[PDB]
Structures are given as C-alpha cells and as structure tokens.
Design an enzyme around this catalytic site. Structure first.
Site, PDB file in Angstrom:
ATOM      1  N   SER A 145       0.783  -1.232   0.000  1.00  0.00           N
ATOM      2  CA  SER A 145       0.000   0.000   0.000  1.00  0.00           C
ATOM      3  C   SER A 145       0.822   1.294   0.000  1.00  0.00           C
ATOM      4  CB  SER A 145      -0.894   0.068   1.225  1.00  0.00           C
ATOM      5  OG  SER A 145      -1.944  -0.886   1.179  1.00  0.00           O
ATOM      6  N   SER A 191      -6.446   2.999   3.493  1.00  0.00           N
ATOM      7  CA  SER A 191      -5.834   2.054   2.608  1.00  0.00           C
ATOM      8  C   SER A 191      -6.821   1.166   1.805  1.00  0.00           C
ATOM      9  CB  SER A 191      -4.872   1.151   3.394  1.00  0.00           C
ATOM     10  OG  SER A 191      -3.552   1.564   3.161  1.00  0.00           O
ATOM     11  N   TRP A 236       1.565  -3.603   3.997  1.00  0.00           N
ATOM     12  CA  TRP A 236       1.565  -4.950   4.582  1.00  0.00           C
ATOM     13  C   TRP A 236       1.187  -5.930   3.500  1.00  0.00           C
ATOM     14  CZ3 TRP A 236      -0.715  -6.546   9.987  1.00  0.00           C
ATOM     15  CH2 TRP A 236      -0.347  -7.874  10.245  1.00  0.00           C
ATOM     16  N   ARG A 286       3.377  -1.458  14.382  1.00  0.00           N
ATOM     17  CA  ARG A 286       4.222  -0.599  13.550  1.00  0.00           C
ATOM     18  C   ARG A 286       4.286   0.853  14.107  1.00  0.00           C
ATOM     19  NH1 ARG A 286       1.336  -2.060   8.050  1.00  0.00           N
ATOM     20  NH2 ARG A 286      -0.342  -2.029   9.614  1.00  0.00           N
TER      21      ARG A 286
HETATM   22  C1  LIG Z   1      -1.595  -2.232   1.606  1.00  0.00           C
HETATM   23  O1  LIG Z   1      -0.449  -2.518   1.934  1.00  0.00           O
HETATM   24  C2  LIG Z   1      -2.697  -3.208   1.764  1.00  0.00           C
HETATM   25  N1  LIG Z   1      -2.291  -4.594   1.969  1.00  0.00           N
HETATM   26  C3  LIG Z   1      -3.031  -5.654   1.590  1.00  0.00           C
HETATM   27  O2  LIG Z   1      -4.085  -5.606   0.980  1.00  0.00           O
HETATM   28  C4  LIG Z   1      -2.563  -6.970   1.976  1.00  0.00           C
HETATM   29  N2  LIG Z   1      -2.769  -7.417   3.128  1.00  0.00           N
HETATM   30  O3  LIG Z   1      -3.344  -6.789   4.047  1.00  0.00           O
HETATM   31  C5  LIG Z   1      -3.400  -7.462   5.296  1.00  0.00           C
HETATM   32  C6  LIG Z   1      -3.446  -6.416   6.397  1.00  0.00           C
HETATM   33  C7  LIG Z   1      -2.157  -8.326   5.430  1.00  0.00           C
HETATM   34  C8  LIG Z   1      -4.644  -8.356   5.315  1.00  0.00           C
HETATM   35  O4  LIG Z   1      -4.933  -8.972   6.363  1.00  0.00           O
HETATM   36  O5  LIG Z   1      -5.362  -8.462   4.293  1.00  0.00           O
HETATM   37  C9  LIG Z   1      -1.940  -7.878   1.028  1.00  0.00           C
HETATM   38  C10 LIG Z   1      -1.054  -8.868   1.445  1.00  0.00           C
HETATM   39  S1  LIG Z   1      -0.580  -9.808   0.089  1.00  0.00           S
HETATM   40  C11 LIG Z   1      -1.644  -8.897  -0.930  1.00  0.00           C
HETATM   41  N3  LIG Z   1      -1.849  -9.119  -2.254  1.00  0.00           N
HETATM   42  N4  LIG Z   1      -2.328  -7.941  -0.277  1.00  0.00           N
HETATM   43  C12 LIG Z   1      -3.448  -2.665   2.962  1.00  0.00           C
HETATM   44  N5  LIG Z   1      -2.661  -2.607   4.185  1.00  0.00           N
HETATM   45  C13 LIG Z   1      -3.184  -2.476   5.419  1.00  0.00           C
HETATM   46  C14 LIG Z   1      -2.182  -2.328   6.503  1.00  0.00           C
HETATM   47  O6  LIG Z   1      -1.063  -1.867   6.212  1.00  0.00           O
HETATM   48  O7  LIG Z   1      -2.407  -2.668   7.678  1.00  0.00           O
HETATM   49  C15 LIG Z   1      -4.511  -2.382   5.644  1.00  0.00           C
HETATM   50  C16 LIG Z   1      -5.050  -1.735   6.918  1.00  0.00           C
HETATM   51  N6  LIG Z   1      -5.558  -2.669   7.944  1.00  0.00           N
HETATM   52  C17 LIG Z   1      -4.971  -3.859   8.173  1.00  0.00           C
HETATM   53  C18 LIG Z   1      -5.418  -4.705   9.184  1.00  0.00           C
HETATM   54  C19 LIG Z   1      -6.481  -4.312   9.983  1.00  0.00           C
HETATM   55  C20 LIG Z   1      -7.059  -3.075   9.755  1.00  0.00           C
HETATM   56  C21 LIG Z   1      -6.572  -2.262   8.730  1.00  0.00           C
HETATM   57  C22 LIG Z   1      -5.551  -2.781   4.596  1.00  0.00           C
HETATM   58  S2  LIG Z   1      -4.853  -3.685   3.238  1.00  0.00           S
END
Ligand SMILES: *C(=O)[C@@H](NC(=O)/C(=N\OC(C)(C)C(=O)O)c1csc(N)n1)[C@@H]1NC(C(=O)O)=C(C[n+]2ccccc2)CS1
Length: 243
Positions: free
Chosen positions: A49, A96, A189, A229
């Site tokens: 992201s 995000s 992430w 983080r």
């Molecule tokens: C940006 O980096 C987005 N990442 C993803 O979409 C991915 N995973 O997100 C996680 C948090 C791991 C998930 O459980 O789905 C991803 C991994 S491999 C792939 N193709 N996509 C957004 N990043 C985040 C974050 O940095 O935390 C998000 C915010 N969030 C996360 C967890 C709980 C609440 C909010 C949304 S996805």
C-alpha cells in the site's frame, strides 16, 4: 550519507517486540539506520500500500481523478468493512482502500504507469504486465532506503510532479499531531508465502517546519496487532528526540 546510528536502545526496542526490522531516518541528506536487522535497509521488498502515494500522484497529475471525486461503492462485500462506502481519494488513502487504488491504476493504464514509474525511478521500477496489482504481489520492489528518499522528496515538494498535486497528496497523509509536531505517513503490509513485510513510511514535520523522514520496515506475523508498527515507530522517534 547512509550510516548506522548511535543506538543500542532502538535495537533493543525491536528485539523486545520479537521482530526483525529496520528504521531508516533521513534528515536533510544524512540517513541513519536503526533496528535489529540493518541489512533490510538495502533489501528490496514490495511497497504494498505504500505505493498508494505514487498512484495518487500519477493519477492526479494526469487528471484521471481529482480530490473531490467520489468513488462509488457498488455494494459487493469487501476485504474490510470500513471500505464499504463511497469515498474520496483522500479518504481511501487513510483507510488504505485497495479497490479505489486499483480503479485508479486501471484509469491510468499500463503504458503511463510504467513511463511514470521509470521516470520517478521508484524501486526497481518493474511493473511488468498486470496494471492493477504490481505494487502488492510484485514484480515491483523497493528498499527501505529508497522509500525514505521518496517520502523525503514528497515532503519537500521535490518530486517531479506539479506542486499542487504534491500538496494535495501530502494533505491526504496526516496521521497524528501533538505538541505542534505533525506526523505524516502510510502503512503497508503484504502477505507473501515467504515472509510478511510491514511498512510505515512518512515524515515528521517539527514545530519550526523542519522535516524528518522515516521508513519503518519489519517482518510481520498474523499474531501481531496492526498497531505494532505505529507503536515501535513512535517509541523510536521519541528516543531519538525527533518528537
Ligand atoms: C496495503 O499494503 C494493503 N495490503 C493488503 O491488501 C494486503 N494485506 O493486508 C493485510 C493487512 C495483510 C490483510 O490482512 O489483508 C496484502 C497482502 S498480500 C496482498 N496481495 N495484499 C493494505 N494494508 C493495510 C495495513 O497496512 O495494515 C490495511 C489496513 N488494515 C490492516 C489490518 C487491519 C485493519 C486495517 C488494509 S490492506
């Protein structure tokens, strides 16, 4: 320029959270490394992201969207409930919301995307072939040192984009503010079957205007709070007296 920093204490902080990670800090042209796994700073990972910042810049620059546009939620169930609504590019930045950043990437389309990424020189500037997920699964990769250099230039309005566009994307990134210190940034992430990489990249704007940029990059596990983080970044910033 790029060196390790004075800190036994931050090394500890990272061991104490039971992770392998690094924190890159850039002030003016000096970059310091802190953490318990310094070699990550020069290791390439997917931006995940954190790329939303570059996507927004390219999108706005080429008038594929504007900061007033309302991206419509069509009604389908999404990976997170907070995404389930109409929202602006700015509100998507904060949450995000991947599906917004994917719509935008498609509007941009592959040729402009890759001309722009090569133009900016982001990471290994490899978008390859799928326009709508290259920043999440590869091939696009970037190091933590490259990220901090990217956000430092965004902070200072030194990226090769319109000044207004840079200001509009900066204004989407305000995370926290207190004691007259502002903290701007973006999490990221990615869940690759190898390791999981977690990002937090942005900057501090101190009361007198001075900018201190940061790029936290650590190994994540599903058992960790998403909070971890921000917690580790804020402890480390305070210890270095950046805030
Ligand atoms: C940006 O980096 C987005 N990442 C993803 O979409 C991915 N995973 O997100 C996680 C948090 C791991 C998930 O459980 O789905 C991803 C991994 S491999 C792939 N193709 N996509 C957004 N990043 C985040 C974050 O940095 O935390 C998000 C915010 N969030 C996360 C967890 C709980 C609440 C909010 C949304 S996805």
């Amino acid at each position: 320029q790029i060196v390790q920093g004075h800190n036994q204490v931050i090394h500890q902080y990272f061991d104490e959270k039971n992770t392998s990670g690094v924190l890159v800090i850039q002030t003016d042209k000096k970059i310091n490394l802190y953490g318990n796994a310094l070699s990550r700073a020069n290791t390439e990972y997917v931006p995940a992201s954190t790329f939303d910042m570059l996507n927004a810049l390219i999108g706005l620059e080429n008038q594929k969207t504007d900061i007033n546009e309302i991206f419509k939620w069509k009604g389908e169930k999404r990976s997170f409930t907070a995404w389930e609504k109409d929202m602006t590019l700015g509100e998507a930045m904060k949450l995000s919301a991947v599906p917004v950043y994917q719509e935008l990437a498609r509007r941009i389309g592959l040729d402009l995307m890759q001309k722009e990424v090569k133009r900016i020189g982001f990471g290994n500037a490899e978008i390859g072939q799928q326009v709508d997920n290259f920043w999440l699964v590869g091939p696009l990769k970037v190091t933590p040192i490259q990220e901090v250099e990217f956000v430092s230039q965004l902070a200072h309005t030194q990226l090769p984009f319109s000044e207004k566009v840079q200001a509009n994307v900066k204004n989407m990134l305000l995370l926290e503010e207190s004691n007259g210190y502002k903290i701007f940034g973006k999490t990221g992430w990615a869940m690759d079957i190898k390791s999981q990489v977690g990002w937090l990249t942005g900057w501090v704007e101190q009361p007198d205007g001075k900018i201190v940029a940061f790029a936290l990059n650590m190994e994540m596990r599903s058992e960790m709070p998403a909070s971890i983080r921000n917690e580790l970044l804020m402890k480390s910033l305070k210890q270095l007296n950046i805030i």
